Amino acid sequence: ELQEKLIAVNRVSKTVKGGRIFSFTALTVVGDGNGRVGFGYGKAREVPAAIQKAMEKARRNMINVALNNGTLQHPVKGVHTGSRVFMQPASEGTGIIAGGAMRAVLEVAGVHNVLAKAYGSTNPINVVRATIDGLENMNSPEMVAAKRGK
RNA sequence: AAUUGAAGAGUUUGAUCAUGGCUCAGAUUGAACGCUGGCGGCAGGCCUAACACAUGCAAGUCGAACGGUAACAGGAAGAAG
Ligand SMILES: [Mg+2]
Ligand SMILES: [Mg+2]
């Protein structure tokens, strides 16, 4: 069964003529724990509800990745907007070593051990999906062997 | 057998994304200060005035190199209570 995790919940203001109205935005990541991971960004005027919305959207935007064992193939660089990401497969008995929301994304995607680092802005929203871009463009030996033989 | 290696957070805005500074979570020391203080092992102990120094000790040893009896530990002769 899928597992879901909540990264952060924020508050945003609209300052209408009448006054100031506050809304809540939630970011969540869902995944099967083997190959499939997705993220959702929901909003609402109450917390519990925004979370719900997010989950729904995440489930419907899962993506697939190839994982040599519980680890990546090769080092990959992820970039989006203003957040750079770097990851290394590392050995097996090392645990997960990552920062804010990278632990969430990788654990949900099913990476039991990896070395990760974030450069530039650390904005949960960008860092999420910046990791996922790298996992997207990761190339596996099986799909690179389509060139010829092995 | 002797390469098992990399975490971030707070803070500018009504709110957002950047840029950019400040601050914190770690480790370490020949440390000092405050409160407190049972024992043991190993190590350490003037980082400032190469400023000035009372007192004691820290370079002596060879008679199997040679003249010698100033100490005195023996012996012999001689003079003697
Ligand atoms: Mg920055
Ligand atoms: Mg002496």
Tab-separated table of N, CA, C and O (backbone and C1' of nucleotides) in Angstrom, chain B residues 5-70:
chain	number	residue	atom	x	y	z
B	5	G	P	33.357	6.763	6.255
B	5	G	O5'	32.944	7.696	5.031
B	5	G	C5'	33.443	9.020	4.930
B	5	G	C4'	32.670	9.832	3.922
B	5	G	C3'	31.178	9.973	4.172
B	5	G	O3'	30.871	10.968	5.133
B	5	G	C1'	31.584	9.500	1.876
B	6	A	P	29.341	11.284	5.506
B	6	A	O5'	28.975	12.551	4.611
B	6	A	C5'	29.432	13.852	4.966
B	6	A	C4'	28.672	14.937	4.243
B	6	A	C3'	27.188	14.653	4.002
B	6	A	O3'	26.447	15.869	4.090
B	6	A	C1'	28.258	15.027	1.938
B	7	A	P	25.859	16.367	5.499
B	7	A	O5'	24.295	16.092	5.382
B	7	A	C5'	23.585	16.402	4.188
B	7	A	C4'	22.221	16.973	4.482
B	7	A	C3'	22.224	18.316	5.208
B	7	A	O3'	21.086	19.079	4.807
B	7	A	C1'	21.131	16.712	6.543
B	8	G	P	21.193	20.145	3.608
B	8	G	O5'	20.326	21.377	4.122
B	8	G	C5'	18.929	21.243	4.346
B	8	G	C4'	18.612	21.148	5.817
B	8	G	C3'	17.927	22.360	6.432
B	8	G	O3'	16.528	22.385	6.205
B	8	G	C1'	19.740	21.723	7.795
B	9	A	P	15.778	23.780	5.925
B	9	A	O5'	15.639	24.443	7.367
B	9	A	C5'	14.885	23.818	8.394
B	9	A	C4'	15.068	24.525	9.712
B	9	A	C3'	14.727	26.007	9.720
B	9	A	O3'	13.339	26.251	9.865
B	9	A	C1'	16.825	25.678	10.756
B	10	G	P	12.677	27.570	9.233
B	10	G	O5'	13.137	28.736	10.214
B	10	G	C5'	12.759	28.727	11.582
B	10	G	C4'	13.356	29.893	12.328
B	10	G	C3'	13.170	31.257	11.683
B	10	G	O3'	11.898	31.822	11.945
B	10	G	C1'	15.423	30.999	12.350
B	11	U	P	11.127	32.644	10.801
B	11	U	O5'	11.960	33.995	10.674
B	11	U	C5'	12.096	34.869	11.784
B	11	U	C4'	13.191	35.883	11.568
B	11	U	C3'	13.071	36.741	10.320
B	11	U	O3'	12.154	37.810	10.469
B	11	U	C1'	15.283	35.943	10.512
B	12	U	P	10.885	37.941	9.490
B	12	U	O5'	11.182	39.261	8.653
B	12	U	C5'	12.364	39.386	7.870
B	12	U	C4'	12.539	40.799	7.374
B	12	U	C3'	11.400	41.320	6.493
B	12	U	O3'	11.127	42.689	6.785
B	12	U	C1'	13.447	41.476	5.323
B	13	U	P	9.639	43.141	7.190
B	13	U	O5'	8.741	42.677	5.958
B	13	U	C5'	8.607	43.494	4.805
B	13	U	C4'	7.620	42.918	3.820
B	13	U	C3'	6.232	42.607	4.357
B	13	U	O3'	5.403	43.753	4.453
B	13	U	C1'	7.004	40.782	3.072
B	14	G	P	4.453	43.961	5.734
B	14	G	O5'	3.222	42.985	5.469
B	14	G	C5'	2.238	42.762	6.468
B	14	G	C4'	1.112	41.901	5.954
B	14	G	C3'	1.527	40.626	5.236
B	14	G	O3'	1.834	39.568	6.128
B	14	G	C1'	-0.103	41.757	3.950
B	15	A	P	3.263	38.835	6.062
B	15	A	O5'	3.116	37.810	4.852
B	15	A	C5'	2.205	36.724	4.930
B	15	A	C4'	1.781	36.253	3.563
B	15	A	C3'	2.889	35.735	2.659
B	15	A	O3'	3.277	34.405	2.951
B	15	A	C1'	1.524	37.222	1.443
B	16	U	P	4.792	33.936	2.691
B	16	U	O5'	4.942	33.984	1.106
B	16	U	C5'	4.126	33.172	0.279
B	16	U	C4'	4.532	33.261	-1.171
B	16	U	C3'	6.005	33.048	-1.471
B	16	U	O3'	6.371	31.679	-1.480
B	16	U	C1'	5.200	34.911	-2.691
B	17	C	P	7.854	31.233	-1.058
B	17	C	O5'	8.730	31.551	-2.350
B	17	C	C5'	8.397	30.990	-3.610
B	17	C	C4'	9.194	31.619	-4.723
B	17	C	C3'	10.694	31.711	-4.498
B	17	C	O3'	11.366	30.493	-4.766
B	17	C	C1'	9.887	33.778	-5.320
B	18	A	P	12.900	30.311	-4.331
B	18	A	O5'	13.694	31.241	-5.351
B	18	A	C5'	15.019	31.661	-5.073
B	18	A	C4'	15.362	32.929	-5.813
B	18	A	C3'	16.640	33.625	-5.376
B	18	A	O3'	17.790	33.057	-5.976
B	18	A	C1'	14.886	35.211	-5.580
B	19	U	P	19.052	32.633	-5.081
B	19	U	O5'	19.825	34.005	-4.848
B	19	U	C5'	20.204	34.821	-5.945
B	19	U	C4'	20.444	36.243	-5.510
B	19	U	C3'	21.329	36.415	-4.287
B	19	U	O3'	22.708	36.348	-4.601
B	19	U	C1'	19.399	37.772	-4.075
B	20	G	P	23.715	35.528	-3.658
B	20	G	O5'	23.881	36.461	-2.379
B	20	G	C5'	24.315	37.806	-2.514
B	20	G	C4'	23.895	38.643	-1.334
B	20	G	C3'	24.267	38.098	0.034
B	20	G	O3'	25.617	38.332	0.387
B	20	G	C1'	22.010	38.751	0.061
B	21	G	P	26.451	37.198	1.161
B	21	G	O5'	26.104	37.444	2.696
B	21	G	C5'	26.931	38.274	3.495
B	21	G	C4'	26.130	39.124	4.449
B	21	G	C3'	26.000	38.603	5.869
B	21	G	O3'	27.164	38.828	6.646
B	21	G	C1'	23.901	39.390	5.117
B	22	C	P	27.732	37.672	7.607
B	22	C	O5'	26.770	37.722	8.874
B	22	C	C5'	26.647	38.907	9.645
B	22	C	C4'	25.496	38.816	10.616
B	22	C	C3'	25.454	37.566	11.480
B	22	C	O3'	26.321	37.632	12.599
B	22	C	C1'	23.317	37.952	10.562
B	23	U	P	27.009	36.294	13.162
B	23	U	O5'	25.797	35.476	13.791
B	23	U	C5'	25.070	35.992	14.894
B	23	U	C4'	23.864	35.146	15.218
B	23	U	C3'	24.119	33.666	15.441
B	23	U	O3'	24.652	33.372	16.721
B	23	U	C1'	22.240	33.933	14.043
B	24	C	P	25.663	32.136	16.906
B	24	C	O5'	24.710	30.860	16.913
B	24	C	C5'	23.754	30.677	17.946
B	24	C	C4'	22.796	29.555	17.633
B	24	C	C3'	23.416	28.183	17.434
B	24	C	O3'	23.737	27.537	18.654
B	24	C	C1'	21.838	28.590	15.724
B	25	A	P	25.011	26.562	18.746
B	25	A	O5'	24.443	25.148	18.285
B	25	A	C5'	23.396	24.519	19.009
B	25	A	C4'	22.720	23.443	18.197
B	25	A	C3'	23.604	22.301	17.723
B	25	A	O3'	23.850	21.334	18.729
B	25	A	C1'	22.246	23.044	15.935
B	26	G	P	25.311	21.183	19.373
B	26	G	O5'	26.184	20.616	18.170
B	26	G	C5'	25.983	19.281	17.679
B	26	G	C4'	27.162	18.855	16.841
B	26	G	C3'	28.480	18.726	17.577
B	26	G	O3'	28.573	17.468	18.225
B	26	G	C1'	28.823	19.874	15.544
B	27	A	P	29.406	17.335	19.570
B	27	A	O5'	30.907	17.546	19.082
B	27	A	C5'	31.636	16.462	18.485
B	27	A	C4'	32.753	16.981	17.612
B	27	A	C3'	33.985	17.516	18.327
B	27	A	O3'	34.816	16.470	18.802
B	27	A	C1'	33.420	18.983	16.594
B	28	U	P	35.140	16.380	20.351
B	28	U	O5'	36.403	17.334	20.504
B	28	U	C5'	37.607	17.063	19.771
B	28	U	C4'	38.384	18.334	19.547
B	28	U	C3'	38.887	19.040	20.794
B	28	U	O3'	40.046	18.387	21.319
B	28	U	C1'	37.998	20.624	19.275
B	29	U	P	40.597	18.725	22.773
B	29	U	O5'	41.122	20.219	22.623
B	29	U	C5'	42.342	20.517	21.928
B	29	U	C4'	42.881	21.846	22.391
B	29	U	C3'	43.344	21.880	23.841
B	29	U	O3'	44.443	22.772	23.988
B	29	U	C1'	41.570	23.405	23.553
B	30	G	P	45.869	22.404	23.371
B	30	G	O5'	46.809	22.352	24.651
B	30	G	C5'	46.726	21.251	25.568
B	30	G	C4'	47.007	21.723	26.971
B	30	G	C3'	45.951	22.628	27.580
B	30	G	O3'	45.996	22.503	28.987
B	30	G	C1'	47.950	23.837	27.353
B	31	A	P	44.672	22.183	29.788
B	31	A	O5'	43.679	23.327	29.302
B	31	A	C5'	42.975	24.148	30.247
B	31	A	C4'	43.129	25.602	29.880
B	31	A	C3'	42.323	26.578	30.726
B	31	A	O3'	43.078	26.968	31.861
B	31	A	C1'	41.903	27.000	28.450
B	32	A	P	42.608	26.544	33.325
B	32	A	O5'	41.876	27.848	33.869
B	32	A	C5'	42.566	29.087	33.954
B	32	A	C4'	41.648	30.248	33.677
B	32	A	C3'	40.416	30.346	34.564
B	32	A	O3'	40.689	30.958	35.813
B	32	A	C1'	39.774	30.588	32.307
B	33	C	P	40.090	30.342	37.171
B	33	C	O5'	38.610	30.924	37.234
B	33	C	C5'	38.381	32.325	37.247
B	33	C	C4'	36.959	32.659	36.874
B	33	C	C3'	35.876	31.994	37.709
B	33	C	O3'	35.644	32.647	38.946
B	33	C	C1'	35.348	31.760	35.423
B	34	G	P	35.204	31.797	40.237
B	34	G	O5'	33.674	31.444	39.967
B	34	G	C5'	32.672	32.447	40.032
B	34	G	C4'	31.300	31.882	39.762
B	34	G	C3'	30.908	30.662	40.582
B	34	G	O3'	30.446	30.994	41.880
B	34	G	C1'	30.399	30.275	38.309
B	35	C	P	30.736	30.016	43.121
B	35	C	O5'	29.717	28.811	42.908
B	35	C	C5'	28.315	29.017	43.005
B	35	C	C4'	27.543	27.775	42.639
B	35	C	C3'	27.954	26.497	43.352
B	35	C	O3'	27.421	26.384	44.660
B	35	C	C1'	27.764	26.065	41.046
B	36	U	P	28.251	25.608	45.797
B	36	U	O5'	28.398	24.128	45.226
B	36	U	C5'	27.266	23.280	45.118
B	36	U	C4'	27.581	22.000	44.383
B	36	U	C3'	28.643	21.108	45.001
B	36	U	O3'	28.171	20.351	46.101
B	36	U	C1'	29.014	21.277	42.676
B	37	G	P	29.183	19.930	47.278
B	37	G	O5'	30.138	18.852	46.596
B	37	G	C5'	29.606	17.647	46.068
B	37	G	C4'	30.618	16.905	45.228
B	37	G	C3'	31.897	16.481	45.930
B	37	G	O3'	31.737	15.306	46.706
B	37	G	C1'	32.422	17.436	43.831
B	38	G	P	32.554	15.123	48.076
B	38	G	O5'	33.025	13.602	48.040
B	38	G	C5'	34.042	13.174	47.145
B	38	G	C4'	34.227	11.679	47.194
B	38	G	C3'	35.453	11.134	46.478
B	38	G	O3'	36.644	11.259	47.234
B	38	G	C1'	33.571	9.856	45.870
B	39	C	P	38.064	11.339	46.484
B	39	C	O5'	38.258	9.878	45.882
B	39	C	C5'	38.314	8.745	46.735
B	39	C	C4'	38.404	7.458	45.956
B	39	C	C3'	39.519	7.370	44.929
B	39	C	O3'	40.788	7.102	45.497
B	39	C	C1'	37.516	6.573	43.975
B	40	G	P	42.110	7.740	44.842
B	40	G	O5'	42.377	6.833	43.561
B	40	G	C5'	42.669	5.452	43.706
B	40	G	C4'	42.435	4.685	42.429
B	40	G	C3'	43.334	5.030	41.254
B	40	G	O3'	44.623	4.450	41.352
B	40	G	C1'	41.095	4.835	40.515
B	41	G	P	45.895	5.192	40.709
B	41	G	O5'	45.812	4.832	39.160
B	41	G	C5'	46.044	3.507	38.704
B	41	G	C4'	45.835	3.390	37.216
B	41	G	C3'	46.643	4.348	36.354
B	41	G	O3'	47.970	3.905	36.135
B	41	G	C1'	44.390	4.348	35.636
B	42	C	P	49.176	4.964	36.058
B	42	C	O5'	48.996	5.646	34.631
B	42	C	C5'	49.120	4.885	33.441
B	42	C	C4'	48.691	5.671	32.229
B	42	C	C3'	49.330	7.040	32.056
B	42	C	O3'	50.638	6.995	31.516
B	42	C	C1'	47.006	7.222	31.724
B	43	A	P	51.732	8.080	31.976
B	43	A	O5'	51.220	9.446	31.333
B	43	A	C5'	51.341	9.679	29.938
B	43	A	C4'	50.406	10.761	29.456
B	43	A	C3'	50.791	12.194	29.784
B	43	A	O3'	51.801	12.711	28.935
B	43	A	C1'	48.485	11.876	30.200
B	44	G	P	52.816	13.834	29.470
B	44	G	O5'	51.870	15.083	29.741
B	44	G	C5'	51.450	15.929	28.661
B	44	G	C4'	50.446	16.931	29.159
B	44	G	C3'	51.016	18.065	29.988
B	44	G	O3'	51.502	19.080	29.127
B	44	G	C1'	49.068	17.209	31.026
B	45	G	P	52.806	19.891	29.526
B	45	G	O5'	52.303	20.798	30.731
B	45	G	C5'	51.338	21.839	30.507
B	45	G	C4'	50.889	22.419	31.821
B	45	G	C3'	51.997	22.839	32.765
B	45	G	O3'	52.485	24.124	32.415
B	45	G	C1'	50.322	21.669	33.959
B	46	C	P	54.041	24.441	32.553
B	46	C	O5'	54.134	25.963	32.104
B	46	C	C5'	53.237	26.943	32.646
B	46	C	C4'	53.388	28.240	31.897
B	46	C	C3'	54.819	28.718	31.704
B	46	C	O3'	54.927	29.520	30.540
B	46	C	C1'	53.650	30.307	32.959
B	47	C	P	55.148	28.860	29.108
B	47	C	O5'	54.301	29.804	28.155
B	47	C	C5'	52.873	29.807	28.223
B	47	C	C4'	52.321	30.516	27.019
B	47	C	C3'	51.735	31.891	27.294
B	47	C	O3'	51.937	32.711	26.157
B	47	C	C1'	50.069	30.509	26.402
B	48	U	P	52.930	33.949	26.240
B	48	U	O5'	52.006	35.100	26.830
B	48	U	C5'	52.072	36.434	26.307
B	48	U	C4'	51.896	37.432	27.422
B	48	U	C3'	53.181	37.852	28.132
B	48	U	O3'	53.174	39.269	28.289
B	48	U	C1'	51.601	37.091	29.708
B	49	A	P	54.414	40.151	27.783
B	49	A	O5'	55.607	39.642	28.706
B	49	A	C5'	56.958	39.710	28.264
B	49	A	C4'	57.920	39.377	29.378
B	49	A	C3'	57.569	38.129	30.179
B	49	A	O3'	58.763	37.485	30.626
B	49	A	C1'	57.535	40.013	31.606
B	50	A	P	59.157	36.024	30.085
B	50	A	O5'	60.606	36.221	29.457
B	50	A	C5'	60.768	36.839	28.184
B	50	A	C4'	62.108	37.520	28.059
B	50	A	C3'	62.214	38.527	26.916
B	50	A	O3'	63.079	39.596	27.296
B	50	A	C1'	63.796	36.805	26.591
B	51	C	P	62.472	40.989	27.820
B	51	C	O5'	62.869	41.030	29.362
B	51	C	C5'	62.074	40.376	30.342
B	51	C	C4'	61.996	41.179	31.616
B	51	C	C3'	63.015	40.835	32.692
B	51	C	O3'	64.287	41.418	32.469
B	51	C	C1'	60.870	40.992	33.663
B	52	A	P	65.609	40.716	33.055
B	52	A	O5'	65.480	40.895	34.633
B	52	A	C5'	65.647	42.169	35.237
B	52	A	C4'	65.485	42.103	36.736
B	52	A	C3'	66.370	41.102	37.460
B	52	A	O3'	67.687	41.584	37.675
B	52	A	C1'	64.149	40.917	38.257
B	53	C	P	68.827	40.596	38.225
B	53	C	O5'	68.152	39.921	39.498
B	53	C	C5'	68.729	38.790	40.133
B	53	C	C4'	67.890	38.349	41.304
B	53	C	C3'	68.278	37.031	41.955
B	53	C	O3'	69.366	37.152	42.855
B	53	C	C1'	65.939	37.087	41.616
B	54	A	P	69.927	35.856	43.621
B	54	A	O5'	69.151	35.861	45.014
B	54	A	C5'	69.337	36.916	45.945
B	54	A	C4'	68.873	36.530	47.329
B	54	A	C3'	69.392	35.206	47.868
B	54	A	O3'	70.712	35.284	48.375
B	54	A	C1'	67.069	35.347	48.248
B	55	U	P	71.788	34.153	47.991
B	55	U	O5'	71.159	32.809	48.573
B	55	U	C5'	71.036	32.615	49.974
B	55	U	C4'	70.259	31.364	50.305
B	55	U	C3'	70.757	30.071	49.681
B	55	U	O3'	71.890	29.519	50.331
B	55	U	C1'	68.433	30.207	49.386
B	56	G	P	73.036	28.793	49.465
B	56	G	O5'	72.424	27.359	49.135
B	56	G	C5'	72.289	26.380	50.154
B	56	G	C4'	71.476	25.193	49.698
B	56	G	C3'	72.004	24.426	48.496
B	56	G	O3'	73.077	23.552	48.806
B	56	G	C1'	69.696	24.797	48.220
B	57	C	P	74.406	23.552	47.899
B	57	C	O5'	74.027	22.638	46.649
B	57	C	C5'	73.938	21.227	46.781
B	57	C	C4'	72.958	20.635	45.800
B	57	C	C3'	73.428	20.522	44.357
B	57	C	O3'	74.270	19.410	44.105
B	57	C	C1'	71.287	21.484	44.386
B	58	A	P	75.293	19.448	42.863
B	58	A	O5'	74.357	19.587	41.578
B	58	A	C5'	73.681	18.459	41.041
B	58	A	C4'	73.022	18.767	39.718
B	58	A	C3'	73.951	19.071	38.553
B	58	A	O3'	74.482	17.900	37.955
B	58	A	C1'	72.205	20.667	38.613
B	59	A	P	75.505	18.003	36.719
B	59	A	O5'	76.915	17.633	37.355
B	59	A	C5'	77.593	18.549	38.207
B	59	A	C4'	79.085	18.329	38.188
B	59	A	C3'	79.931	19.604	38.180
B	59	A	O3'	81.129	19.397	38.926
B	59	A	C1'	80.442	18.311	36.281
B	60	G	P	81.106	19.465	40.530
B	60	G	O5'	81.089	17.936	40.973
B	60	G	C5'	82.276	17.158	40.961
B	60	G	C4'	82.183	16.010	39.987
B	60	G	C3'	83.238	14.926	40.149
B	60	G	O3'	82.892	13.989	41.153
B	60	G	C1'	83.092	15.550	37.871
B	61	U	P	84.029	13.308	42.061
B	61	U	O5'	84.774	12.325	41.057
B	61	U	C5'	84.053	11.344	40.327
B	61	U	C4'	84.910	10.725	39.255
B	61	U	C3'	86.260	10.207	39.723
B	61	U	O3'	86.163	8.908	40.278
B	61	U	C1'	86.532	11.497	37.749
B	62	C	P	87.420	8.241	41.016
B	62	C	O5'	88.347	7.751	39.819
B	62	C	C5'	89.623	7.194	40.084
B	62	C	C4'	90.503	7.193	38.860
B	62	C	C3'	91.995	7.288	39.134
B	62	C	O3'	92.567	6.036	39.468
B	62	C	C1'	91.404	8.838	37.451
B	63	G	P	92.783	5.634	41.008
B	63	G	O5'	94.250	6.156	41.332
B	63	G	C5'	95.343	5.821	40.486
B	63	G	C4'	96.583	5.505	41.283
B	63	G	C3'	96.365	4.571	42.471
B	63	G	O3'	97.513	3.745	42.658
B	63	G	C1'	97.206	6.637	43.240
B	64	A	P	97.451	2.181	42.291
B	64	A	O5'	97.501	2.153	40.699
B	64	A	C5'	98.626	2.664	39.990
B	64	A	C4'	98.409	2.618	38.498
B	64	A	C3'	97.176	3.367	38.002
B	64	A	O3'	97.424	3.901	36.702
B	64	A	C1'	96.969	1.078	37.462
B	65	A	P	97.222	5.469	36.413
B	65	A	O5'	98.704	6.045	36.381
B	65	A	C5'	99.649	5.584	35.426
B	65	A	C4'	100.640	6.664	35.083
B	65	A	C3'	101.406	7.250	36.259
B	65	A	O3'	102.529	6.473	36.637
B	65	A	C1'	100.495	9.004	34.990
B	66	C	P	102.946	6.357	38.185
B	66	C	O5'	103.644	7.753	38.496
B	66	C	C5'	104.739	8.204	37.715
B	66	C	C4'	105.065	9.649	37.994
B	66	C	C3'	105.389	9.990	39.440
B	66	C	O3'	106.722	9.665	39.792
B	66	C	C1'	103.882	11.590	38.563
B	67	G	P	107.148	9.545	41.336
B	67	G	O5'	107.684	11.001	41.696
B	67	G	C5'	107.926	11.373	43.042
B	67	G	C4'	107.813	12.864	43.230
B	67	G	C3'	107.622	13.338	44.662
B	67	G	O3'	108.839	13.413	45.385
B	67	G	C1'	106.050	14.411	43.263
B	68	G	P	108.902	12.891	46.901
B	68	G	O5'	107.833	13.797	47.657
B	68	G	C5'	107.255	13.379	48.885
B	68	G	C4'	105.927	14.051	49.119
B	68	G	C3'	105.089	13.503	50.266
B	68	G	O3'	105.454	14.057	51.519
B	68	G	C1'	103.736	13.812	48.333
B	69	U	P	106.703	13.482	52.347
B	69	U	O5'	106.477	14.058	53.815
B	69	U	C5'	105.499	13.495	54.684
B	69	U	C4'	104.155	14.166	54.529
B	69	U	C3'	103.139	13.818	55.613
B	69	U	O3'	102.293	14.939	55.867
B	69	U	C1'	102.315	13.116	53.512
B	70	A	P	101.987	15.383	57.380
B	70	A	O5'	100.652	16.245	57.268
B	70	A	C5'	100.700	17.660	57.169
B	70	A	C4'	99.385	18.221	56.692
B	70	A	C3'	98.138	17.565	57.266
B	70	A	O3'	97.794	18.054	58.553
B	70	A	C1'	97.920	17.740	54.923
